Amino acid sequence: IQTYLPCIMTVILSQVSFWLNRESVPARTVFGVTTVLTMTTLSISARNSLPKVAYATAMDWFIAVCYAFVFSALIEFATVNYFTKRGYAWDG
Amino acid sequence: TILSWVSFWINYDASAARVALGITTVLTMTTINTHLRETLPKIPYVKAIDMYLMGCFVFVFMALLEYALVNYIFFG
Amino acid sequence: PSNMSLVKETVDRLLKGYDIRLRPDFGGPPVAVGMNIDIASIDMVSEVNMDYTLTMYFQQAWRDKRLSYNVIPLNLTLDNRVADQLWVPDTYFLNDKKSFVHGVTVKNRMIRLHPDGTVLYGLRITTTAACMMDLRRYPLDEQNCTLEIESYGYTTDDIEFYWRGDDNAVTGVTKIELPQFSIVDYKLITKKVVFSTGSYPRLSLSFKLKRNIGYFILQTYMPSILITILSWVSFWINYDASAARVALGITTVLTMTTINTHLRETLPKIPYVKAIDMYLMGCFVFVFMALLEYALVNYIFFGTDVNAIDRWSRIFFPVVFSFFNIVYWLYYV
Ligand SMILES: *[C@@H]1O[C@H](CO)[C@@H](O[C@@H]2O[C@H](CO)[C@@H](O[C@@H]3O[C@H](CO[C@H]4O[C@H](CO)[C@@H](O)[C@H](O)[C@@H]4O)[C@@H](O)[C@H](O[C@H]4O[C@H](CO)[C@@H](O)[C@H](O)[C@@H]4O)[C@@H]3O)[C@H](O)[C@H]2NC(C)=O)[C@H](O)[C@H]1NC(C)=O
Ligand SMILES: *[C@@H]1O[C@H](CO)[C@@H](O[C@@H]2O[C@H](CO)[C@@H](O[C@@H]3O[C@H](CO[C@H]4O[C@H](CO)[C@@H](O)[C@H](O)[C@@H]4O)[C@@H](O)[C@H](O[C@H]4O[C@H](CO)[C@@H](O)[C@H](O)[C@@H]4O)[C@@H]3O)[C@H](O)[C@H]2NC(C)=O)[C@H](O)[C@H]1NC(C)=O
Ligand SMILES: *[C@@H]1O[C@H](CO)[C@@H](O[C@@H]2O[C@H](CO)[C@@H](O[C@@H]3O[C@H](CO[C@H]4O[C@H](CO)[C@@H](O)[C@H](O)[C@@H]4O)[C@@H](O)[C@H](O[C@H]4O[C@H](CO)[C@@H](O)[C@H](O)[C@@H]4O)[C@@H]3O)[C@H](O)[C@H]2NC(C)=O)[C@H](O)[C@H]1NC(C)=O
Ligand SMILES: CCCCCCCC/C=C/CCCCCCCC(=O)O[C@@H](COC(=O)CCCCCCCCCCCCCCC)COP(=O)([O-])OCC[N+](C)(C)C
Ligand SMILES: CC(=O)[C@H]1CC[C@H]2[C@@H]3CC[C@H]4C[C@H](O)CC[C@]4(C)[C@H]3CC[C@]12C
Ligand SMILES: CC(=O)[C@H]1CC[C@H]2[C@@H]3CC[C@H]4C[C@H](O)CC[C@]4(C)[C@H]3CC[C@]12C
Ligand SMILES: CCCCCCCCCCCC
Ligand SMILES: CCCCCCCCCCCC
Ligand SMILES: CCCCCCCCCCCC
Ligand SMILES: CCCCCCCCCCCC
Ligand SMILES: CCCCCCCCCCCC
Ligand SMILES: CCCCCCCCCCCC
Ligand SMILES: CCCCCCCCCCCC
Ligand SMILES: CCCCCCCCCCCC
Numbered sequence: 001i002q003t004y005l006p007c008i009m010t011v012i013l014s015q016v017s018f019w020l021n022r023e024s025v026p027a028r029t030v031f032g033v034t035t036v037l038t039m040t041t042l043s044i045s046a047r048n049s050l051p052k053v054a055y056a057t058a059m060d061w062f063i064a065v066c067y068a069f070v071f072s073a074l075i076e077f078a079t080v081n082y083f084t085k086r087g088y089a090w091d092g
Numbered sequence: 093t094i095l096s097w098v099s100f101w102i103n104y105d106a107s108a109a110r111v112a113l114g115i116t117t118v119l120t121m122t123t124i125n126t127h128l129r130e131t132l133p134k135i136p137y138v139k140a141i142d143m144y145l146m147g148c149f150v151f152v153f154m155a156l157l158e159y160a161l162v163n164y165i166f167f168g
Numbered sequence: 169p170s171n172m173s174l175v176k177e178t179v180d181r182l183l184k185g186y187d188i189r190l191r192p193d194f195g196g197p198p199v200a201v202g203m204n205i206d207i208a209s210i211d212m213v214s215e216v217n218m219d220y221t222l223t224m225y226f227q228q229a230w231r232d233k234r235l236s237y238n239v240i241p242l243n244l245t246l247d248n249r250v251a252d253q254l255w256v257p258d259t260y261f262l263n264d265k266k267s268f269v270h271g272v273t274v275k276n277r278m279i280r281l282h283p284d285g286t287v288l289y290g291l292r293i294t295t296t297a298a299c300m301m302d303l304r305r306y307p308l309d310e311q312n313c314t315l316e317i318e319s320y321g322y323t324t325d326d327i328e329f330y331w332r333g334d335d336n337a338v339t340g341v342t343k344i345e346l347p348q349f350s351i352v353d354y355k356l357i358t359k360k361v362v363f364s365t366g367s368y369p370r371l372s373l374s375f376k377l378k379r380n381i382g383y384f385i386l387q388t389y390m391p392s393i394l395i396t397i398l399s400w401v402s403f404w405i406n407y408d409a410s411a412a413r414v415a416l417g418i419t420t421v422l423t424m425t426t427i428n429t430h431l432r433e434t435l436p437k438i439p440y441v442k443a444i445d446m447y448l449m450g451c452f453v454f455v456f457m458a459l460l461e462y463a464l465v466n467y468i469f470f471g472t473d474v475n476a477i478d479r480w481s482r483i484f485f486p487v488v489f490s491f492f493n494i495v496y497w498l499y500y501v
């Protein structure tokens with residue numbers, strides 16, 4: 001309830017962007033950057049409890065994989081935006 | 093949690109605004125919960141405060157999903 | 169119990185009329201004192217306080233004719249409280265800030281008399297010794313922390329030091345497992361430091377500590393590398409998306425200065441610029457130039473070719489950053 005749940009939910013947050021229309025560039029972009037920054041502080045915050053061991057713990061791999069998902073979710077949107085041929089969204 | 097609901101009075105076609113509001117609120121709850129739990133020992137169970145912060149997290153997160161549900165029904 | 173009575177008489181004679189105020193061979197040649205350490209552990213290697221904590225079994229061996237006995241064939245291990253009735257060298261660690269002899273279950277000392285007069289005197293000491301660290305290449309740095317064993321009141325005319333066993337006097341260095349340091353080398357020196365009060369013997373035990381970089385990739389470099397890569401995403405968004413690119417821009421810039429500020433507070437307030445500062449400051453330029461890249465894009469348009477600046481920047485930024493890494497990592501590693 002200190003690292004895994006915040007790590008799991010920020011991964012869920014990044015996947016809310018997939019259900020938003022591709023034309024909402026600011027909204028989906030803030031989704032990506034906010035989760036990535038949130039994932040960064042969680043990774044930095046997580047290590048603070050235990051010593052400065054060189055190797056990587058099981059928490060580190062879970063945080064690393066969750067970093068891949070949130071980061072891949074933003075690269076996914078950049079790919080989606082690359083093929084967005086029109087700026088205006090659906091109306092009516 | 094109260095300010096999370098002002099997203100519901102905002103226009104549906106304000107993705108940049110409501111998402112910014114909803115994202116801002118849900119992240120703040122995590123920081124408050126994380127910040128609060130730091131002051132206490134590394135206790136392995138949910139306290140009364142924890143069961144409230146987690147309870148409030150659900151509402152604010154649902155408010156964020158409320159718009160995502162609204163956005164999908166309209167465009168999708 | 170007959171042998172116990174015999175030992176009692178012998179040990180009683182040695183302390184009878186024993187002048188604790190006078191060293192062995194007082195008024196005569198210097199007494200040679202032999203030392204051998206057993207490093208139990210090294211902990212709290214702190215650059216905020218510029219010190220390291222050292223736990224060791226610190227043995228001293230010297231000859232004292234007054235404590236010579238011949239009747240008993242065995243070597244006498246006596247209760248540690250006898251040390252208060254015996255002359256012992258007044259050795260101190262010059263760079264020691266805070267030290268103590270372990271106290272439970274009793275005073276962690278040893279007194280062992282040998283028939284020829286030799287006295288083996290051991291202590292279990294935990295000393296926080298001062299180690300001034302040159303953090304210029306931190307965290308890719310090698311530190312050289314030392315322990316300066318020296319006699320306080322007795323000059324070289326009254327006492328001498330030597331590593332008992334020479335290069336085999338200190339043990340346990342290989343077993344020591346620091347979390348963020350690898351003890352690459354250790355050396356033993358015998359000096360003669362001169363003060364205004366005379367010249368004194370000096371034993372210096374230096375450990376060369378090499379820092380492990382694996383921890384700092386997890387918490388320091390990779391978060392800054394990923395944020396730098398994140399800022400390059402803005403080059404893939406069309407120029408007219410001002411809120412998206414600017415929000416991507418400032419967030420990367422502001423987080424980067426936050427990471428730099430967050431880390432440097434955990435360290436002491438050294439004036440110079442470390443290696444982690446060089447990388448974080450170097451990656452601050454790319455993220456800042458990434459934001460200025462959009463500002464030029466916005467200015468040139470509102471103030472075909474606009475894509476070219478957005479297209480060439482699409483590749484040179486990951487290229488120039490890679491070369492910066494080649495120069496940085498090659499230079500420091
Ligand atoms: C009271 O205390 C004394 C002092 O410790 C004990 O006597 C010593 O016992 C030690 C046991 O550790 C003996 O150590 C061995 O000495 C051998 C001979 O050393 C001679 O040469 C050295 C050179 O400096 C002198 O200092 C020393 O006095 C001797 O004259 C060494 O060969 C041994 O090392 C060898 O170990 C193995 C097995 O032999 C080999 O495989 C190694 O390669 C290496 O060659 C070892 O160091 C020593 O003999 C005793 N005298 C000393 C140290 O002066 C008493 O026994 C003790 N009283 C008791 C127990 O009642
Ligand atoms: C700095 O470092 C030095 C290291 O030398 C410390 O100095 C020693 O401190 C200890 C602890 O106080 C001293 O031990 C004391 O010895 C006294 C003398 O013992 C002899 O005489 C008595 C009779 O008077 C005999 O019975 C005994 O067998 C010895 O022959 C004792 O009288 C002291 O007793 C005190 O402590 C006991 C603890 O059980 C109490 O019950 C007593 O009532 C009494 O309070 C004590 O044991 C030692 O003598 C000091 N010198 C040396 C050379 O060791 C310093 O303490 C340390 N700190 C500072 C600030 O200097
Ligand atoms: C952490 O940093 C400290 C620096 O403060 C290092 O300690 C110094 O190390 C050096 C090298 O080990 C010491 O310098 C000299 O080492 C000599 C070793 O012998 C070599 O050199 C001689 C002469 O050059 C050759 O003949 C021989 O074959 C070897 O190649 C000592 O013998 C030196 O002492 C003699 O010279 C001095 C100066 O002329 C005289 O004053 C002495 O009386 C004596 O005759 C000398 O010690 C140096 O002393 C160390 N201490 C310092 C500088 O304070 C540590 O090594 C480093 N940590 C690690 C792990 O390396
Ligand atoms: C010297 C060697 C030094 C080594 C470094 C060198 C670096 C080199 C890399 C340089 C960057 C690569 C892009 C260069 C091309 C840019 C232009 C472009 O858009 O090209 C094309 C698309 O290109 C793609 O399809 C995207 C490929 C890169 C995305 C990688 C995704 C994985 C992210 C993983 C990251 C995870 C994080 C990593 C974790 C550690 C299309 O171009 P265009 O726009 O359509 O117009 C051209 C057509 N025209 C000519 C007709 C007009
Ligand atoms: C249909 C619809 O309206 C969309 C709008 C928002 C969507 C949710 C976002 C979060 C998602 C996290 C995980 O991806 C699992 C599915 C997940 C719960 C989604 C369920 C379907 C929703 C409600
Ligand atoms: C012409 C142009 O491309 C524009 C786009 C962005 C502009 C810069 C922004 C930051 C400014 C800070 C200070 O106000 C000094 C001037 C300053 C350096 C500007 C120089 C001109 C630039 C490069
Ligand atoms: C916190 C350190 C994690 C390092 C790995 C992150 C994943 C890189 C992005 C992958 C995108 C496909
Ligand atoms: C290098 C930084 C990440 C870039 C991700 C965007 C990729 C878009 C490619 C679309 C054309 C194939
Ligand atoms: C084991 C305790 C679970 C805590 C669950 C917190 C959320 C409950 C309240 C939800 C309100 C909608
Ligand atoms: C005294 C050292 C000053 C270092 C200033 C930062 C250098 C960053 C270089 C970035 C290259 C693009
Ligand atoms: C320490 C003396 C001042 C050095 C200033 C160096 C500035 C380098 C900046 C490189 C990026 C433009
Ligand atoms: C201060 C703005 C920096 C702009 C960097 C642009 C790099 C590519 C230029 C190529 C022009 C064809
Ligand atoms: C980084 C500074 C670049 C300055 C660019 C000024 C361009 C003025 C207009 C002429 C080119 C279209
Ligand atoms: C000794 C540790 C080496 C770490 C190297 C990091 C490389 C990052 C390069 C990123 C280029 C896009």
Ligand SMILES: CCCCCCCCCCCC
Nearest residue numbers: 490491492493494497498501
């Ligand atoms: C693509 C370039 C990545 C950066 C290169 C890192 C070089 C590390 C050298 C390690 C010591 C030999």
Ligand SMILES: CCCCCCCC
Nearest residue numbers: 001004005008009012
């Ligand atoms: C022990 C179960 C913890 C709750 C998991 C959270 C799933 C979203």
Ligand SMILES: CCCCCCCC
Nearest residue numbers: 146147149150151153
């Ligand atoms: C253990 C009960 C958890 C209920 C939480 C509400 C759904 C996210």
Ligand SMILES: CCCCCCCC
Nearest residue numbers: 157160161164165168
């Ligand atoms: C959680 C919302 C599910 C219902 C969405 C409407 C049907 C596509």
